Each structure stands twice: as structure tokens, then as C-alpha cells.
């Protein structure tokens, strides 16, 4: 497998580096996250974890 990055950091994609419901808390996240980062094969799962976040209102 392969993984995502953000600034000084490298980390697995499928949960945010910021606290969950991260787009609702800090909506300008993409303006740090996605300058050249769109090339990552993990970006699809970073996106799913960021927006369809399974936020604290949901359950599994």
C-alpha cells in the first residue's frame, strides 16, 4: 500500500489529521491540504474520511 501527506507530516488517509467533522470545524482545510496533493492514490479515502466523516451524530 501507499499513504497521504500534509505539510511537515506523512500519515494514513482514512481518518483526518485535524479532529473529526474537520470540514464543519475548519472548512478552509483543503486550502492547506490540496495544493499539489491531488496526485496521492489515497486521496479518495482522505476525501471520504474528511466529508462523509462518520461524525459523532452517526453510529456503527
Amino acid at each position, epitope marked *: 500500500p501507499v499513504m497521504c501527506l500534509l505539510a511537515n507530516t506523512t500519515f494514513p488517509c482514512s481518518q483526518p489529521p485535524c479532529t473529526p467533522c474537520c470540514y464543519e470545524k475548519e472548512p478552509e482545510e483543503t486550502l492547506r491540504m490540496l495544493e499539489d496533493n491531488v496526485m496521492r492514490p489515497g486521496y479518495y479515502q482522505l476525501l471520504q474520511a474528511s466529508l*462523509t466523516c462518520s461524525p*459523532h451524530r*452517526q*453510529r456503527r
Partner: antibody
Amino acid sequence: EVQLVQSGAEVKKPGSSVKVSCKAFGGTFSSYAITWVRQAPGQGLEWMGGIIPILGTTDYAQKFQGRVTITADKSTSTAYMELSSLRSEDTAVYYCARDPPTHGGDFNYYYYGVAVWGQGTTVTVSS
Amino acid sequence: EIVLTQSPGTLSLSPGERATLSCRASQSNNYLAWYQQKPGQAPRLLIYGASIRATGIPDRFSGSGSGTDFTLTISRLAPEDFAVYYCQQYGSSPLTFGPGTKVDIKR
């Protein structure tokens, strides 16, 4: 996964209204087309001949209303269902807590990327 | 149109290994999905067919289709997998649920 809830079980008599309720939470502040499926005691899943997806019109399947009359509602996260002037055979478990049921052949279409199910609730139309 | 039909009308297996449930109609186009009912209890989602997968839970149960036919498999079915299984495609003048294929854990 979207979190799902219903009103508790009931006991009822024929010829009156039943005001069942469902609530869906985390996303879905407008219902993701949740639908009032129903199963008669111990049978295979012969389903609700009434309500299909709803949140703008009370759309049923091609069967009920003809024997017994049914409708549903579209409030924020909150999907009421009214079944009325019913008879003993309308005793069933009702599973509102269900996926989008995409209506192939007449209007518009629905997603795959998240699962959604849940518990059932019982109305006991009884003597 | 059609009415969905499931190929096993009964099945029975010990704890462990594998199952392969199956369902058919002369068309597909808009997703059917496979649902498991434990005795006395509400269904839950296992699979989507027609072209692409979805699930609620980790990949012990999984499935696929070809031409007219659509399938559901369970891996290491030792747990509470005594259940009846259904699928549906919802739309227009009737299409409806499958009949309910039942499989059990061989006491």
C-alpha cells in the same frame, strides 16, 4: 452509518389511526429516502404494498390503499407514517430503518457509498 | 416485470468455511442488494450487485454477479449465521423482493 430510531411497539383495534414514527441522524437532516418496509408475523419478506421512498410526496407501491389506507411524511430527520382504518392482518413488524430504494423506471436515482439499516417495531391489531 | 428468484430453496452447513447464495432475473441495470435476517430480528445489508460493491461491515461476507445472476458468500460462518436472506430492486410497476433463501449452522 446513519443512526436509525423508531417509536415503541403498540396494541390496536380495527377501524382507527396508527401514528408510527422514525428518526434518522448524522447527516440525513433531509431523509436519505428511508422507507416503511413491513413484514407479517413469521412470513418471508412479502413487503409494504404501501409506502416506497418519501420526502416530498407520500409515494406508495402498486398495491395498498385498495384494502387499507396508508401515508408517510418528510420532516427534518423525522419520517412519520400513518396507517388508518386498518384490520387484524395489518399486524406486522415495520422496518422504516432502511437504505435508499432507488425507483428504477419513472423519475430519479440514488447512492452506494454508505450502508444504512436498523431495528423494527410492532403494532398488535388484536381482540 | 420479472420477480427475483433465489437459487437455493434450503441449505445447511457446519461452523467454518463457505456459503454461496444466488439470485436471478432476466435483467439488472439498477442495483439489487443482499440482506440477512436472523430469526425474530430485523435485516441488515451485506452487499450491492449490478456493477459495484458496498458493505456495512468488514469483509468476511462478500459477493458478485454475472449476466442474469447475482450472488452472496460468507466466510468462516461459525457465528449466529442461522438466517434467511433476501434482495430487491424497488422501482416502477412491480419488481419486489426475492423469496427468502434460508441457511443454518448444523447442530
